[PDB]
Design an enzyme around this catalytic site. Structure first.
Site, PDB file in Angstrom:
ATOM      1  N   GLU A 207     -11.001 -25.864  59.759  1.00 59.91           N
ATOM      2  CA  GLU A 207      -9.937 -26.838  59.526  1.00 59.91           C
ATOM      3  C   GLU A 207     -10.142 -27.584  58.211  1.00 59.91           C
ATOM      4  O   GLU A 207      -9.191 -27.766  57.456  1.00 59.91           O
ATOM      5  CB  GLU A 207      -9.821 -27.821  60.692  1.00 59.91           C
ATOM      6  CG  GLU A 207      -9.305 -27.220  61.990  1.00 59.91           C
ATOM      7  CD  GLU A 207      -7.851 -26.759  61.922  1.00 59.91           C
ATOM      8  OE1 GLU A 207      -7.167 -26.970  60.886  1.00 59.91           O
ATOM      9  OE2 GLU A 207      -7.434 -26.115  62.908  1.00 59.91           O
TER      10      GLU A 207
ATOM     11  N   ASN B 238       2.052 -29.840  56.139  1.00 63.27           N
ATOM     12  CA  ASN B 238       2.568 -28.745  56.935  1.00 63.27           C
ATOM     13  C   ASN B 238       4.044 -28.515  56.523  1.00 63.27           C
ATOM     14  O   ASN B 238       4.701 -29.385  55.950  1.00 63.27           O
ATOM     15  CB  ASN B 238       2.420 -29.013  58.449  1.00 63.27           C
ATOM     16  CG  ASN B 238       0.970 -29.342  58.910  1.00 63.27           C
ATOM     17  OD1 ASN B 238      -0.077 -28.548  58.811  1.00 63.27           O
ATOM     18  ND2 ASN B 238       0.922 -30.514  59.570  1.00 63.27           N
TER      19      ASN B 238
ATOM     20  N   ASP C  82       6.717 -28.384  58.271  1.00 61.10           N
ATOM     21  CA  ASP C  82       7.679 -29.244  58.970  1.00 61.10           C
ATOM     22  C   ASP C  82       7.779 -30.671  58.367  1.00 61.10           C
ATOM     23  O   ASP C  82       8.611 -31.484  58.804  1.00 61.10           O
ATOM     24  CB  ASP C  82       7.405 -29.248  60.494  1.00 61.10           C
ATOM     25  CG  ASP C  82       6.133 -29.970  60.878  1.00 61.10           C
ATOM     26  OD1 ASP C  82       5.435 -30.484  59.986  1.00 61.10           O
ATOM     27  OD2 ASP C  82       5.804 -30.016  62.083  1.00 61.10           O
TER      28      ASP C  82
ATOM     29  N   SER D  28       5.227 -32.840  58.271  1.00 67.48           N
ATOM     30  CA  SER D  28       4.057 -33.596  58.721  1.00 67.48           C
ATOM     31  C   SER D  28       2.843 -33.255  57.859  1.00 67.48           C
ATOM     32  O   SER D  28       2.901 -32.348  57.019  1.00 67.48           O
ATOM     33  CB  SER D  28       3.793 -33.305  60.188  1.00 67.48           C
ATOM     34  OG  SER D  28       3.387 -31.969  60.381  1.00 67.48           O
TER      35      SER D  28
ATOM     36  N   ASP E  86      -1.654 -32.986  58.043  1.00 71.94           N
ATOM     37  CA  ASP E  86      -2.891 -32.931  58.810  1.00 71.94           C
ATOM     38  C   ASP E  86      -4.013 -33.676  58.097  1.00 71.94           C
ATOM     39  O   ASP E  86      -4.162 -33.562  56.880  1.00 71.94           O
ATOM     40  CB  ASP E  86      -3.333 -31.489  58.946  1.00 71.94           C
ATOM     41  CG  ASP E  86      -2.500 -30.705  59.895  1.00 71.94           C
ATOM     42  OD1 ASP E  86      -1.674 -31.243  60.649  1.00 71.94           O
ATOM     43  OD2 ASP E  86      -2.630 -29.505  59.891  1.00 71.94           O
TER      44      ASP E  86
ATOM     45  N   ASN F 150      -2.528 -33.954  63.166  1.00 67.56           N
ATOM     46  CA  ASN F 150      -1.230 -34.130  62.526  1.00 67.56           C
ATOM     47  C   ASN F 150      -0.530 -35.473  62.752  1.00 67.56           C
ATOM     48  O   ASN F 150      -0.781 -36.229  63.704  1.00 67.56           O
ATOM     49  CB  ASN F 150      -0.295 -32.973  62.871  1.00 67.56           C
ATOM     50  CG  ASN F 150       0.351 -33.121  64.238  1.00 67.56           C
ATOM     51  OD1 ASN F 150       1.154 -34.044  64.496  1.00 67.56           O
ATOM     52  ND2 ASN F 150       0.006 -32.198  65.127  1.00 67.56           N
TER      53      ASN F 150
ATOM     54  N   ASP G  86      -4.522 -32.208  76.296  1.00 66.00           N
ATOM     55  CA  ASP G  86      -3.048 -32.252  76.364  1.00 66.00           C
ATOM     56  C   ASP G  86      -2.457 -31.063  77.114  1.00 66.00           C
ATOM     57  O   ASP G  86      -1.255 -31.055  77.385  1.00 66.00           O
ATOM     58  CB  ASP G  86      -2.444 -32.316  74.943  1.00 66.00           C
ATOM     59  CG  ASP G  86      -0.954 -32.659  74.934  1.00 66.00           C
ATOM     60  OD1 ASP G  86      -0.574 -33.691  75.518  1.00 66.00           O
ATOM     61  OD2 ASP G  86      -0.161 -31.896  74.331  1.00 66.00           O
TER      62      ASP G  86
HETATM   63 YB   LIG Z   1      -2.226 -27.697  59.262  1.00 66.33          YB
END
Ligand SMILES: [Yb+3]
Ligand SMILES: [Cl-]
Ligand SMILES: [Cl-]
Ligand SMILES: [Yb+3]
Ligand SMILES: [Yb+3]
EC number: 3.2.1.17
Length: 129
Positions: free
Chosen positions: A35, A46, A48, A50, A52, A59, A101
């Site tokens: 990551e 990202n 979309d 957003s 990270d 995110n 989650d």
């Molecule tokens: Yb990512």
């Protein structure tokens, strides 16, 4: 902060990630490697819109607030900047919520694609623990 492998393993253990939700320490170290390359300051946008943040690339749509992500839920109740700190507590606290989650560590696509099913124990080799 750019952590060493065993340094990060030790920090994650101290903050109670070892075997959290059944995921051994090496799973967490492997996820962090792919990551963020162990860099607490890692940020990546990202598609979309957003972003990270941090060692585990958490995110801003669901988990943290960065002020520029429409629909932000901020479920970890934390500014995204708190996930870039040298102290990994906020990232670990938030990761605990994420992994609880429903889909476990599959929440981290890089974990699924690069860590899942592999010899993750190698990530804690030689470390004093
Ligand atoms: Yb990512
Ligand atoms: Cl392990
Ligand atoms: Cl699971
Ligand atoms: Yb501290
Ligand atoms: Yb020990």
């Amino acid at each position: 902060k750019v952590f060493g492998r065993c340094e990060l393993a030790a920090a994650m253990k101290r903050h109670g990630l070892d075997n959290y939700r059944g995921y051994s320490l090496g799973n967490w170290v492997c996820a962090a490697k792919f990551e963020s390359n162990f860099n607490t300051q890692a940020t990546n946008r990202n598609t979309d819109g957003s972003t990270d943040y941090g060692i585990l690339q958490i995110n801003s749509r669901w988990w943290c607030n960065d002020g520029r992500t429409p629909g932000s839920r901020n479920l970890c109740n934390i500014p995204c900047s708190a996930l870039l700190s040298s102290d990994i507590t906020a990232s670990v606290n938030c990761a605990k919520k994420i992994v609880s989650d429903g889909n476990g560590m599959n929440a981290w696509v890089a974990w699924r694609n690069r860590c899942k099913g592999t010899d993750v124990q190698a990530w804690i080799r030689g470390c004093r623990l």
